[PDB]
């Protein structure tokens, strides 16, 4: 609700803010490659006293 002049302004704003929105599809890719190893080798003795 406004005077005839302000209205014609607010009609060209609303006309330009009413546009159609684009939507986005966002994929993430989480990669992980792990590789372990170990090796253990040793001799032990024991005896009497």
Interface with another protein includes 23 (CB under 8 A)? no
Residue whose tokens read 């006293």? 49
CA distance 46 to 48: 7
CA distance 29 to 25: 13
Interface with another protein includes 44 (CB under 8 A)? no
Helix (H/G/I), strand (E/B), else coil: 13? helix
Q: Give the nearest distance from C-beta 20 to another protein in angstroms.
A: 13
Q: Give the nearest distance from C-beta 4 to another protein in angstroms.
A: 5
Instruction: Tell me which residues in 1-20 interact with another protein (CB under 8 A).
Output: 3-4, 8-10, 12-13, 16-17
């Amino acid at each position: 609700t406004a005077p005839q002049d302000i209205m014609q302004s607010l009609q060209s704003v609303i006309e330009q803010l009413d546009i159609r929105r684009a939507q986005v599809h966002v994929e993430a890719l989480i990669v992980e490659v792990a590789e372990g190893s170990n090796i253990n080798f040793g001799v032990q003795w024991a005896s009497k006293d």
